[PDB]
Amino acid sequence: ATRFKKNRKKRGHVSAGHGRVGKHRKHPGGRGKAGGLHHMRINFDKYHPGYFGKVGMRHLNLLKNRTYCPTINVDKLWGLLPEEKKKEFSENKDIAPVIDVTRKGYFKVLGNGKLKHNQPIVVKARYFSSVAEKKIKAVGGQCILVA
Amino acid sequence: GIALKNVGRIKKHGRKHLVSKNPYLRLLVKLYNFLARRTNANFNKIIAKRLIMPKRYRPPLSLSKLQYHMANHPNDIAVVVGSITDDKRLFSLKQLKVCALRFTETARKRIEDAGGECLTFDQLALKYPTGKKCVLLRGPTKARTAEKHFGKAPGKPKSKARPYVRSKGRKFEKARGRRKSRAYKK
Amino acid sequence: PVANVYSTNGKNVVGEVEIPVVFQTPIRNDLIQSVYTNMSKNRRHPY
Amino acid sequence: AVKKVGKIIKKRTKKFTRFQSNRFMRVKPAWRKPRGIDCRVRRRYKGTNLMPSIGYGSNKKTKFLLPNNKYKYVVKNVKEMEPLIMNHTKYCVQIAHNVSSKKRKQIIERAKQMNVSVINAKARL
Amino acid sequence: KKLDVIYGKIHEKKVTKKNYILPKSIVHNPDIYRIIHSDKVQASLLAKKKPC
Amino acid sequence: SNVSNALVWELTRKSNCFIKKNKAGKKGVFLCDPLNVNYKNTPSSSGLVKSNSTNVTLKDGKVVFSVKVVNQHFKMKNVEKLLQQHGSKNKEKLLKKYKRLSKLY
Amino acid sequence: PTKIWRRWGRKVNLKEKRYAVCSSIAASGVTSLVLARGHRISHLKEVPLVVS
RNA sequence: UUACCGAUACCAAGCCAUAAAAAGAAGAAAAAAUUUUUUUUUAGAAUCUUUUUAUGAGUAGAAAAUCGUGGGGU
RNA sequence: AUUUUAAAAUUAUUUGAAUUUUUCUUCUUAUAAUUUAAGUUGUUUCUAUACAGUACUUUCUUAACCCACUCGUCUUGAAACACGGACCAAGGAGUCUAGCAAAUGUGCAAGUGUAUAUGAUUCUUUAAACAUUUUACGCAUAAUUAAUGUAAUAUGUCUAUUGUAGAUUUGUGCCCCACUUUGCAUACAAUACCGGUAAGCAA
RNA sequence: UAAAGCUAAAUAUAUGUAGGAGACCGAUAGCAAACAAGUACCGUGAGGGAAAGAUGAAAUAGUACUCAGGAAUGAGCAAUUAAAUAGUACCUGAAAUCGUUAAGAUGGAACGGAUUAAGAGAGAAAACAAGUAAAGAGGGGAAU
């Protein structure tokens, strides 16, 4: 789309929109992130506050596979399984769904949200938040620890 | 020579015509600004104005917020110019009569099973040309991520602007100017 | 929503067929145009 | 000055010429707005090559019509004459330059029986 | 006939575009002037006004 | 449903094999759609927008009468009578157009 | 200088491509659009014509 | 003390454009011949149509609408 | 083609009244016409009883009155005794890619993108199109901390934090507004809760 | 399970050769080179490095003959061709620059803007006359 470019509409305007006094020189402020702490310091401090310096210790080789764990919050367990099965677990008070969250692909169960009152539900996960446990037990369910 | 602001020409701001070249949306805009012009309804005027808006100003509305907003009046019709998205966090729907520009497949199916129905704006014009018993709703316009970077610059005192960074580890823009231990903080 | 089938001999009609539901999709001239430009770009040879 | 024939008033004749085109051969007379800094014409010094403006625009009721008080339409064959059958007194027809003497006679006779005037009727004969 | 199989009706295993839903229009019926001439909205329109 | 007269106009107001704009004399734009009585590019006159219409136009040196799905073609008194038996002001415009078209060799 | 690493091709969303194909079929299904495209179908019995 | 001359400023009117506004998704008019003919029109495109008012310098700079060129689909 | 209407004025009749007392006195009662309303109409000549001229339209060339300094550029300031330009033709300069954001259009939407690759009577075009046996990967769906890590009201209730403004809706005084009714977006606050840090306690 | 060894495929290929293509360039472009091009030519040398395509369908149509000239050439009542103002520098043949003829201007610049006037070129598409009756040439359509 080179015919939509703004330069085309400055075709006979001498300065090409880049100014008559200041001109368009090449790197008049330095290259890349050159002037940080010196003459681009205001830009750096105004838009990237904590840029300079270092904090914390070093993790030499990380291996993110070790600590990878996705989280599902407590208000999505009932939405994990289909609607007619929600209905069928709802009207019947003698059965509860057992959801292996790990199989859907989450490792930890977090506690944000609201479970349905007096609706037991059993959840299997590798990790649980304490509030997630409290809510699951409060609705009459149980948290099963799995690996 | 005469001393007038803007040389005497009234200046308006915002959209004047729809940018979308969607034929169905163009027909909708024609119908609804005809309705706004002819009827007195501020309802119709607002709908015609909102049909014109950019995508970021007709945000999706979840079924949860739809139900919550329509909680008190159950017999009226929720009219939303954005799209309607399904909320998995919601356990149960109830009998919703909603007119919207677009419906998600999941949200549509949930509404039909709950027993309500999904309405388009041409049907809304056909049945409620003035807007009796129609509650005008819209989703969160300032909730999108791009707005989290706006406002005071990140670095101004008491600024909640989210910066533009590659990633958010400890070694990415977290040392000098973000904690008292390194020079200042914010 | 019907359409009858014509024989290769053009001057007679054979069985009717119900119109497939695909014919009820929005025409969307802008969408098909833009998709056409993007897709037709893929056939080009480099220079 | 303004030229006024009938209801058609042409607000200006003698089309604008490019500044300095008179005394430079490399500068064609076709109008170009001079950017300059100290440019005379741009600054609108009196007595030097005034620039075109929107104020010279002819009125829209009589904008595009020829001195015969009708709009011109350029045709390439007899097929493009059909729309003129309805507005033969609002449109005159001009035959395109690259039309042969084969087709020019046909277009002339068709326009004659269609009762629509032809601008360049006596071309190529 | 196979168009219907391809696009969701009468699903077949290796022919139907799997779990693809035909696009939905944003208007139920584009007969804009028919819905304008409907008497329900004709009653809603107030008296025709006049230019300056 | 899926289509309507307004929608067809919305799709064919710009892109159309029958539109001819007047490049040299900027005033006019004609629509030579075979069911266009007066060749204005207008939804109220465009034959392919109108649900039902009729007009007279010459084909390969013969003047024919076309009526609009159910596209019928027929061949002054004859024109009057088939206009009467296919009728739906515009009638007199059709008659005037035919009588002025008949003078074409 | 022109370089071979210009963005020759484009990536088109599969859903958008399917929408476009469906819309093209629908458009081929109506008489006015086929006529306006440029085809001479004034003697066809119906636009979505099907043969044995 | 009068009269007069004197601007791209002021006033009245026309026209262009910009901005804003009021409003809008179907029927016969005239003329010329002699009851009948003939001639013009007989409109309806929403970034559209009709009408109204105000306004119009401009470097650097920005935007819109336009005008052209090689080549590609239709 | 349903305001060049209505009225206003005038004229000619007509009704009653008033008053400056009447040949333009005023106010209505009716009727019918006019325009001073409700932006120029008429008459007569000429063009001319021609088919292109000595006229009319137009281009060009010359004069004449008034006016008019080389452009481009740097510059506060250029006609400059500031620099480049003898002339003409052709060529001649914000592009391409990567990556990010904003804006807008489009599709789908708590999901989105099918990556590499595979299949398939596709193999001029085709190096594109078409497709993908019911947890690949990116981004998003949760944050916070150097970090072991921890991780969002809370089961009294499929209710969904609280205010002040606020769009829309509902009724009472189908076209005003004041009372009710509902309370989107958003703004300004207040609250809870999550991570970290303090402080208190600490099996 | 080091300090010994071998091993195909999936991978890469600004080289060479041979194929096939292109939203590429179209003789100041595209390779430096469309041609006798890494040639001519330059430098002691390492190296540097061009310009230059097009008559016509057919030269198996490349200009015969005459006159004048020492010859080049020119001219023709002569001659090929559809065409020689297509004659080998040969398609087209712009501008700068120059010639011929005509018209005009002309007291130390010229051109110009605005307004007309006088001349000179061109011109009828609004810049008059539809119809009507007759006779001459034509073209169509409908009616059996």
The tally of beta strands of chain B, per DSSP, is: 5
Number of strands of chain C: 2
SSE class of chain C: alpha+beta
What is the approximate shape of chain C? elongated
Order of SSEs of chain B: HHEHEEHEHE
Helicity range of the residues of chain C?
A: 25-40%
What's the helical proportion of residues of chain B?
A: 25-40%
Largest interface, Cβ cutoff 8 Å: C-G, 29 and 27 residues
Using only C-alpha atoms, the radius of gyration of chain C works out to: 19 Å
Structural class of chain B: alpha/beta
For this entry, what is the oligomeric state of its chains? part of a larger assembly
Distance between the termini of chain B: 51 Å
Order of helices and strands of chain C: EEH
Helix segment count of chain C? 1
Give the count of helical stretches of chain B: 5
Largest sheet of chain C: 2 strands, antiparallel
Overall spatial form of chain B: flat
Record the strand order, biggest sheet of chain C: 1-2
Round the Cα radius of gyration of chain B to an integer and report it: 22 Å
Strand content of chain C: 15-25%
Proportion of residues in β-strands of chain B? 5-15%
Organism (chain G): Plasmodium falciparum (isolate 3D7)
Protein name (chain G): Large ribosomal subunit protein uL4
Family (chain G): Belongs to the universal ribosomal protein uL4 family.
Organism (chain D): Plasmodium falciparum (isolate 3D7)
Could you characterize what this model shows?
This is part of a larger assembly, with 1 copy of chain A (147 residues), 1 copy of chain B (186 residues), 3 copies of chain C, 1 copy of chain D (125 residues) and 1 copy of chain F (105 residues). Chain A contains 5 helices and 6 strands, in the order H-E-H-H-E-H-E-E-E-H-E. Chain A is an alpha/beta fold. In chain A, the strands form 2 sheets. A 3-stranded parallel sheet of chain A has the order 1-3-5. Chain A has a 3-stranded parallel sheet with strand order 2-4-6. The radius of gyration of chain A is 29 Å and the shape is elongated. Chain B is an alpha/beta fold and 186 residues long. Chain B is built from 5 helices and 5 strands, in the order H-H-E-H-E-E-H-E-H-E. In chain B, strands 1, 2, 3, 4 and 5 form a 5-stranded parallel sheet that branches. In chain B, helix 1 packs antiparallel against helix 2 (42-51). Chain C is of the alpha+beta class and 47 residues long. Helices cover 26% and strands 23% of the residues of chain C. A two-stranded antiparallel ribbon of chain C has the order 1-2. Chain C is elongated. Chain F starts with a helix and ends with a helix. The radius of gyration of chain F is 15 Å and the shape is globular. Chain F has helices spanning 5-12, 77-85, 90-101, and strands at 19-21, 29-31, 54-59, 62-67, 72-74. Chains in contact: A-B, A-D, B-C, B-E, B-F, C-E, C-F, C-G, D-F, E-F, E-G, F-G. Chain C binds chain G through residues 3-8, 14, 17, 19, 22-29, 31-32, 35-36, 38-39, 41-42, 44-47, and chain G through 2, 4, 6, 8-10, 12, 16-17, 19-20, 22-27, 29-30, 33, 45-46, 48-52. Chain B binds 3 RNA strands through helix 1, helix 2, strand 1, helix 3 and strand 2. The PDB classes it as ribosome. Keywords: ribosome, malaria, single particle, translation. Single particle CryoEM structure of the Pf80S ribosome in the unloaded state (nrt with E-site tRNA).
